[PDB]
């Protein structure tokens, strides 16, 4: 289809680098024809679930906005990029609403994201006083206070730094290998639709 | 590092934050138990008859342990 204004899914999925999950990255998609054929034609998708819409129907639907959130987590953790999950990631890193509408796409990125003797570039949040509300982002690096004793900006007993690095050796079992995740969230307000499939 | 010496009370070589100072009690054959933490706090279900005291280098109430920072934690002798 020869279109003039086409949504940048290419830019989202084919980015060279991806955010740490704690500091997940969001791109807004608006006022463009969304061709999801470029997702269908991927061989490489390990996970491709949609919530509230059939993946086979995306090219038929209009939305007010689409939001492309992206990040890197463990293979073991993709499970948590779903409505109503718990775990370090879902709880403290990236939470979806219980009534989420969108797709979660993930692929093994061992090839790009692991370095021999570890790639310590990728971080996730290990401690937080509460859980995240849906689509909340926490990038603060305040030393986590466990005890009733203040931490005074330094580390120690009951005073731990809230971010941990993933290992990411090339030799890790699939479960511990890095996966790149894209979360398309379809947003439907009482406004004109700006993002429509070609159908 | 901090060198702890009990008498014949617990003294420290360098100054020690009160928040990271604890008293322990050991009976023959058993593991230690926590009595006092944070210099002057009672552990849960520890009798009223016990009390903790001190700051700086001088601490008064068996073992005293300091746990300040990431490293350099030491115990007294007895």
């Amino acid at each position, epitope marked *: 289809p020869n279109i003039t204004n086409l949504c940048p899914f290419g830019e989202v999925f084919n980015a060279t680098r991806f955010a740490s999950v704690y500091a997940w990255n969001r791109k807004r998609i608006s006022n463009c024809v969304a061709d999801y054929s470029v997702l269908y034609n991927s061989a490489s998708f390990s996970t491709f679930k949609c919530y509230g819409v059939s993946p086979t129907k995306l090219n038929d639907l209009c939305f007010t906005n689409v939001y492309a959130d992206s990040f890197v987590i463990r293979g073991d953790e993709v499970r948590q990029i779903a409505p109503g999950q718990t775990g370090k990631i879902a709880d403290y890193n990236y939470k979806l609403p219980d009534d989420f509408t969108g797709c979660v796409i993930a692929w093994n990125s061992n090839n790009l994201d692991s370095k021999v003797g570890g790639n310590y570039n990728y971080l996730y949040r*290990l401690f937080r006083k509460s859980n995240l509300k849906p689509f909340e982002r926490d990038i603060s690096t305040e030393i986590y206070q*466990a005890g009733s004793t203040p931490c005074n900006g330094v580390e120690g007993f*009951n005073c731990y730094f809230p971010l941990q690095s993933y290992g990411f050796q090339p030799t890790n079992g699939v479960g511990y290998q890095p996966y790149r995740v894209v979360v398309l969230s379809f947003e439907l307000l009482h406004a004109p639709a700006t993002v429509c499939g070609p159908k | 590092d901090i060198v702890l010496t009990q008498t014949p009370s617990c003294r420290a070589s360098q100054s020690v934050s009160s928040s990271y100072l604890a008293w322990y009690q050991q009976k023959p054959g058993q593991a230690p138990r*926590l009595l006092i933490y944070g210099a002057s706090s009672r552990a*849960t279900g520890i009798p009223d008859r016990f009390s903790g005291s001190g700051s700086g280098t001088d601490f008064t109430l068996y073992y005293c342990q300091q746990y300040v920072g*990431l*490293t350099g934690w030491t115990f007294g002798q007895g």
Partner: nanobody, 122 residues
Framework: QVQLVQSGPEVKKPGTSVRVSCKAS????????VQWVRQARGQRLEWVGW????????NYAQKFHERVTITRDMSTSTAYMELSSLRSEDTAVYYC????????????????WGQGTMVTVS
């Protein structure tokens, strides 16, 4: 019930390595930490090191700084202490200890101790 359970007594020979375990149940082990304390026969306490359960961050004392390894296993609620290059000085009773943690916050001291492990090198 809330406790820490160590493995039984160990007997090794000079030079070799030993692998002590410390199992936790009851309290939320993840938000906790585990220190390791050794004690010779009728003598003072000495510090070996400590780990943070969530992170695996280890610090050691001078005497062991390159011949001891404290690891943990969250998915089994078990911490380990590993001493290598054993000698006469390493024939002691080894304890693991933890602060009580209950989800959000923790108590401000090591209020949970094991039953102990006598290690023998002869």
């Amino acid at each position: 019930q809330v406790q820490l359970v160590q493995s039984g007594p160990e007997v090794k020979k000079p030079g070799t390595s030993v692998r002590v375990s410390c199992k936790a149940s009851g309290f939320t082990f993840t938000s906790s930490a585990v220190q390791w304390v050794r004690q010779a026969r009728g003598q003072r306490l000495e510090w070996v090191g400590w780990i943070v359960v969530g992170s695996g961050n280890t610090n050691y004392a001078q005497k062991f700084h390159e011949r001891v390894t404290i690891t943990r296993d969250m998915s089994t609620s078990t911490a380990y202490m590993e001493l290598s290059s054993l000698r006469s000085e390493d024939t002691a009773v080894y304890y693991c200890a933890s602060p009580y943690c209950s989800g959000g916050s923790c108590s401000d001291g090591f209020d949970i101790w094991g039953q102990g492990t006598m290690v023998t090198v002869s």
